[PDB]
């Protein structure tokens, strides 16, 4: 995942192809308990880096809870384009996970939203929490009472 | 006038083309003005280069330097990002004066004679491809 946003051109394409193949041959990684947190963290890092005084140096950033680093382009347009492009795989994988096993992923999402560090900054944007609380809605299903009826 | 000389390098003499103007180097200590004034009645170190001229006027350059320094002060006060280097110059005799030399002198004419190509090739060889980090900073300083 961390190489999906490389500064080059073909590197991200081959990384995307490898990720697609890996998720194809091992479907059980969708409902894992560590991928979602890491991808939300990197999305939040990119969202924070969206507006960080481009002329100021040091475009490097450190992903929390994982030893890695991310570089960003110079112009605003490229950064906006890359963050918008990355903002789609999140929804795709979230809906794919929600389609098959809703209970486990819903419990994981509930557990993620109960950390003290993010509560202080929650008054700001904190795009990860917004993404979670937006993805929870339009992928829900019917409960026990209304699971078997004919329209 | 805000520094005290220490010694003289006895091997830096190099006359230039021209009238017999030569060049010399000095090792100097920077203290200040008031401390220098009070220490001149009782008895952070780098090197400096000096250029001497005979038979030439050095007043229009002084006026231009004053204007440049005033513009630099205005720009620094307003809060923008512009770069100008006001090298000092003082006249002391009719047709004779002392002119400071910027550190690490690199004339464009000499580089053009050496390369006979565009500056883009020179700075591509010196720093690297346009996608590197240093190239962006060099371009920003060039624009400034």
3-state secondary structure B17-86: CCCCCCEEEEEEEECCCHHHHHHCCCCCEEEEEEEEEECCCCCHHHHHHHHHHHHHHHHHHHCCCCCCCC
Distance from CA of A4 to the nearest CA of B (A): 19
Q: CA-CA distance, B89 to B99, in Å (whole number)?
A: 5
Distance from CA of B131 to the nearest CA of A (A): 10
Q: In this structure, what DSSP letter does residue B94 have?
A: T
Chain B CB within 8 Å of residue A74 CB: yes
Distance from CA of A132 to the nearest CA of B (A): 35
Find tokens 């920077």 and name the residue: B30
Contact A57 B137 (CB under 8 A): yes
How many other C-beta atoms can be found within 10 angstroms of the C-beta atom of residue A21? 10
Find tokens 């944007």 and name the residue: A125
Q: Which residues of A touch B131 (CB under 8 A)?
A: 7
Chain B CB within 8 Å of residue A57 CB: yes
Q: How was this structure determined?
A: cryo-EM
Q: Chain A, 31-50: which have a CB under 8 Å from a chain B CB?
A: none
Mutate which: A57, A71, A72, vs B, most B CBs within 10 A: A57
Contact A74 B137 (CB under 8 A): no
Dihedral angle computed from the Cα positions of residues B119, B125, B131 and B133, in that order, rounded to the nearest 10 degrees: -100
How many other C-beta atoms can be found within 10 angstroms of the C-beta atom of residue A131? 19
Contact A57 B140 (CB under 8 A): no
Residues in chain B after which the chain is broken, C→N over 2.5 Å: 18, 43
Chain A CB within 8 Å of residue B136 CB: yes
The β-bridge partners of B54 are: B96
Q: CA-CA distance, B91 to B97, in Å (whole number)?
A: 4
Chain B CB within 8 Å of residue A9 CB: no
């Amino acid at each position: 995942l961390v190489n999906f946003n490389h500064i080059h051109k073909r590197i991200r394409r081959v990384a995307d192809k490898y990720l697609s193949g890996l998720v194809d041959k091992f479907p059980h990684l969708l409902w894992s308990g560590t991928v979602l947190k890491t991808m939300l963290d990197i999305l939040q890092t990119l969202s924070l880096s969206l507006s960080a005084d481009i002329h100021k140096d040091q475009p490097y950033y450190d992903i929390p809870d994982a030893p890695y680093r991310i570089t960003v382009p110079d112009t605003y347009e490229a950064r906006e384009s890359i963050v918008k492009d990355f903002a789609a795989r999140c929804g795709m994988i979230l809906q794919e996970a929600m389609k098959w096993a809703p209970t486990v992923t819903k419990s994981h999402l509930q557990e993620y939203l109960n950390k003290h560090q993010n509560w202080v900054s929650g008054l700001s944007q904190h795009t990860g929490l917004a993404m979670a609380t937006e993805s929870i809605l339009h992928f829900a299903g019917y409960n026990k009472q209304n699971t078997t009826l004919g329209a | 006038p805000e520094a005290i000389v220490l010694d003289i390098d006895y091997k830096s003499g190099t006359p230039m083309q021209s009238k017999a103007p030569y060049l010399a180097k000095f090792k100097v200590k920077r203290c200040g003005v008031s401390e220098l004034e009070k220490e001149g009645l009782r008895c952070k170190i780098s090197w400096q280069a000096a250029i001497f001229k005979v038979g030439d006027d050095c007043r229009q350059d002084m006026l231009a330097l004053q204007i440049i320094d005033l513009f630099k002060n205005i720009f620094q006060l307003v809060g923008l990002d512009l770069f100008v280097f006001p090298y000092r110059v003082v006249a002391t005799a009719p047709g004779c004066g002392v002119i400071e030399c910027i550190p690490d002198c690199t004339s464009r004419d000499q580089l053009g004679r050496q390369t006979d190509f565009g500056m883009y090739d020179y700075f591509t060889r010196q720093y690297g491809d346009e996608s590197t980090l240093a190239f962006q900073q060099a371009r920003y300083n060039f624009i400034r």
